[PDB]
Amino acid sequence: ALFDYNATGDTEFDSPAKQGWMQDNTNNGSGVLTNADGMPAWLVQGIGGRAQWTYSLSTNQHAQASSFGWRMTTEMKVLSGGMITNYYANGTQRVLPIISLDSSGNLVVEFEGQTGRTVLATGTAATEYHKFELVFLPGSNPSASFYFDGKLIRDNIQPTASKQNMIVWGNGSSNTDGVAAYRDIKFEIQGDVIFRGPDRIPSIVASSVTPGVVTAFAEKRVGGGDPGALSNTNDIITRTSRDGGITWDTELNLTEQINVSDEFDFSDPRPIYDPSSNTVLVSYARWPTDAAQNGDRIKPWMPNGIFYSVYDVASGNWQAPIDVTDQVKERSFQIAGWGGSELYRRNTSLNSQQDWQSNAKIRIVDGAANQIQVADGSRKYVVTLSIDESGGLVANLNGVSAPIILQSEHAKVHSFHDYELQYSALNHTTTLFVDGQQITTWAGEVSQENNIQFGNADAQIDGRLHVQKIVLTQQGHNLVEFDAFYLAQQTPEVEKDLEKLGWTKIKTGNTMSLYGNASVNPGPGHGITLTRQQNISGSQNGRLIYPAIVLDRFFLNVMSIYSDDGGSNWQTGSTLPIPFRWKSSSILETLEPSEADMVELQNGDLLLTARLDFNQIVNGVNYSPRQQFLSKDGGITWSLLEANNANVFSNISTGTVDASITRFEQSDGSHFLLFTNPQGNPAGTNGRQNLGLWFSFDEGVTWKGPIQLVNGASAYSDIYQLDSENAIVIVETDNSNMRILRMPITLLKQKLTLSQN
Ligand SMILES: [Ca+2]
Numbered sequence: 001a002l003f004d005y006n007a008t009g010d011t012e013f014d015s016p017a018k019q020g021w022m023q024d025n026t027n028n029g030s031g032v033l034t035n036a037d038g039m040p041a042w043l044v045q046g047i048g049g050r051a052q053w054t055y056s057l058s059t060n061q062h063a064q065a066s067s068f069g070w071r072m073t074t075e076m077k078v079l080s081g082g083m084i085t086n087y088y089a090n091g092t093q094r095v096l097p098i099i100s101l102d103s104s105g106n107l108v109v110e111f112e113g114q115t116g117r118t119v120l121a122t123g124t125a126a127t128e129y130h131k132f133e134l135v136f137l138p139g140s141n142p143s144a145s146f147y148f149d150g151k152l153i154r155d156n157i158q159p160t161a162s163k164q165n166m167i168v169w170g171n172g173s174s175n176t177d178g179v180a181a182y183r184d185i186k187f188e189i190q191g192d193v194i195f196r197g198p199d200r201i202p203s204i205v206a207s208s209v210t211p212g213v214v215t216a217f218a219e220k221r222v223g224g225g226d227p228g229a230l231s232n233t234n235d236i237i238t239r240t241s242r243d244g245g246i247t248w249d250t251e252l253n254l255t256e257q258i259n260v261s262d263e264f265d266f267s268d269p270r271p272i273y274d275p276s277s278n279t280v281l282v283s284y285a286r287w288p289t290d291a292a293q294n295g296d297r298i299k300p301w302m303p304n305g306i307f308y309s310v311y312d313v314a315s316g317n318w319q320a321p322i323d324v325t326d327q328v329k330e331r332s333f334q335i336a337g338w339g340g341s342e343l344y345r346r347n348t349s350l351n352s353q354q355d356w357q358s359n360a361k362i363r364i365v366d367g368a369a370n371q372i373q374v375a376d377g378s379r380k381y382v383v384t385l386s387i388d389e390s391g392g393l394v395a396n397l398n399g400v401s402a403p404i405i406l407q408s409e410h411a412k413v414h415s416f417h418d419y420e421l422q423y424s425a426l427n428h429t430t431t432l433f434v435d436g437q438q439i440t441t442w443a444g445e446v447s448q449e450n451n452i453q454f455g456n457a458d459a460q461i462d463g464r465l466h467v468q469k470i471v472l473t474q475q476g477h478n479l480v481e482f483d484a485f486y487l488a489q490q491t492p493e494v495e496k497d498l499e500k501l502g503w504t505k506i507k508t509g510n511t512m513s514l515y516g517n518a519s520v521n522p523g524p525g526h527g528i529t530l531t532r533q534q535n536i537s538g539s540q541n542g543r544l545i546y547p548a549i550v551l552d553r554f555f556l557n558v559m560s561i562y563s564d565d566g567g568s569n570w571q572t573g574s575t576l577p578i579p580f581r582w583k584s585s586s587i588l589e590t591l592e593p594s595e596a597d598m599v600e601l602q603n604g605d606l607l608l609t610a611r612l613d614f615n616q617i618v619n620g621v622n623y624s625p626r627q628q629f630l631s632k633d634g635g636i637t638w639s640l641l642e643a644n645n646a647n648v649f650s651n652i653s654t655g656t657v658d659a660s661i662t663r664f665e666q667s668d669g670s671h672f673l674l675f676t677n678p679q680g681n682p683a684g685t686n687g688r689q690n691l692g693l694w695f696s697f698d699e700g701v702t703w704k705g706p707i708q709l710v711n712g713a714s715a716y717s718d719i720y721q722l723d724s725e726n727a728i729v730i731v732e733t734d735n736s737n738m739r740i741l742r743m744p745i746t747l748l749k750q751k752l753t754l755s756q757n
């Protein structure tokens with residue numbers, strides 16, 4: 001909440017007594033509107049009496065002040081004298097900087113109960129107007145810092161005693177003369193609640209093109225609780241604030257339109273701000289009101305999906321939501337030949353002296369020895385697909401010795417591709433066609449196998465493959481035809497068990513195979529738009545991107561869902577590489593990266609923070625409750641940042657929670673990242689208390705100590721640069737209520753950059 005005064009120029013209303021303040025003078029002590037050379041302001045005249053303006057707050061207001069903090073900002077001109085007292089006080093302590101001119105005319109500072117005197121300016125600057133800032137950070141061991149003109153003067157100001165309770169400005173001594181023109185005075189009590197519990201899961205972003213427009217989101221949870229409860233209906237909500245986050249328009253439910261009968265639950269509003277059209281693009285997930293992610297009760301045949309809504313910042317209108325599940329929710333039969341070998345065979349009766357046609361739509365997620373095999377009694381044709389240590393798709397054909405680069409662009413390296421095999425009886429050979437691309441021709445080994453076969457061969461070679469369709473035709477008739485895409489999405493009634501459908505499952509060691517994708521969830525915070533992709537291979541500038549959560553069936557992981565199209569068309573990248581281990585038969589041990597956030601780094605690389613959801617230790621190697629991953633290709637594939645997990649943040653909370661990360665861009669040119677997360681009430685604990693904020697000046701290699709932002713409940717949070725000096729912050733606190741913080745990153749940064757001895 002704000003409390004200020006300012007020189008409007010007009011008569012009647014430029015009086016602090018108009019702008020809500022109180023008069024508190026003693027004889028001769030006067031005030032008056034001055035406008036020196038067009039400089040409108042309130043002149044305080046503490047000649048032979050005190051002239052000072054007060055303002056009185058409520059108990060709850062001071063509590064809020066103690067919980068989330070405050071900041072005081074004064075733009076004034078000290079004309080003469082001393083005991084210029086601009087400060088705040090609550091019934092038990094105050095912070096009192098005394099602004100005055102020394103016998104030598106220089107403007108100087110001194111703090112109550114604090115040894116030392118500091119010259120602010122000298123010469124004729126000493127009577128110039130200046131910016132004066134008092135900044136208070138809540139803590140068990142609190143403090144405040146004082147800034148003069150964006151520089152930091154004193155820090156660690158220990159609060160002293162009083163029983164005075166109010167905000168005050170002017171000359172506070174009756175016996176000490178002081179004269180000053182105040183062009184502006186601002187008092188801000190931090191966290192105004194914008195969204196109330198049990199609504200949860202906020203995110204936020206700001207316009208850079210229309211300075212001041214901020215857009216916040218959360219989940220309207222009617223009944224409270226995570227999506228999937230028969231006892232709730234969750235929707236998405238927003239609030240915009242055209243003034244930096246001071247006031248906010250009415251709460252808008254973007255979803256009720258979409259969910260007529262409240263048959264669905266929506267979740268995870270992940271918006272992205274797009275500078276070219278100057279729009280917010282929010283993406284969020286839908287689930288049926290009775291099943292979702294939790295307990296993995298969500299099935300590929302329920303209404304899980306992803307939808308977006310576009311907000312026109314220029315005219316403040318919203319466009320009805322658009323569904324894009326199709327483009328981003330894969331439907332396929334999936335085979336994970338990790339620590340196992342899994343194969344599906346269909347015995348066929350192909351007349352090998354006559355022609356035949358083979359078609360399979362396959363996608364290689366990772367590894368090798370995933371393969372397709374046609375055998376017509378006499379001979380065998382085998383295409384072994386595998387991914388390079390360079391991240392390229394390669395093909396080993398049978399009998400052949402030389403592998404064939406199949407794809408270089410990482411994006412194509414992990415996308416679907418129609419592999420065709422054309423058999424010519426005539427000259428007794430076949431040819432390979434990857435999406436119209438005639439590759440090679442060859443005559444595989446001789447056998448007595450009359451087969452159509454696919455899967456992962458070696459039990460000692462890990463690979464994973466996803467099938468969508470398989471067909472085999474001879475002389476104008478389809479012998480075999482399997483469409484995973486179609487069945488995946490079918491209700492249990494529709495028979496999809498390969499075995500029962502005709503195939504022979506052949507598997508050694510442990511594997512896992514499933515139909516389609518159970519659900520996609522965009523994620524908690526905000527998304528970005530990439531701008532440093534020019535020297536990155538195959539990525540582009542203007543890419544809209546965000547790390548979504550995929551639930552295959554049982555295990556959760558994260559992938560990118562992006563748009564090089566500006567947003568009309570969407571893509572999907574590979575999943576995070578996780579270390580796996582079978583503790584026993586049918587007992588798998590891996591991580592499950594969930595709530596995730598990314599920042600585009602200076603060189604173009606992508607930096608991701610992900611929360612580790614069910615089990616964080618694999619092979620005795622502990623993974624904190626959080627891990628970082630890096631992508632050097634625009635978010636197509638990632639690589640784990642070994643030993644870049646929770647521990648990277650001193651004093652972070654050992655609990656598992658959602659955090660946030662962003663880029664902060666200084667007008668002067670410099671930049672860095674801002675990172676939010678709770679700390680726990682005592683030294684790095686498992687508790688959602690005292691949200692902190694780390695920075696990183698070296699591009700996420702390291703981070704610098706958590707500066708505390710809150711004293712109390714701190715949960716999910718999201719941060720985004722408001723303007724050149726500010727970062728607005730949105731968190732969950734008491735009873736999950738979501739509060740707003742307007743941080744001055746430019747000033748706070750300084751509490752970390754100085755070296756003293
Ligand atoms: Ca529900």
Ligand SMILES: [Ca+2]
Nearest residue numbers: 524525658659
């Ligand atoms: Ca987040």
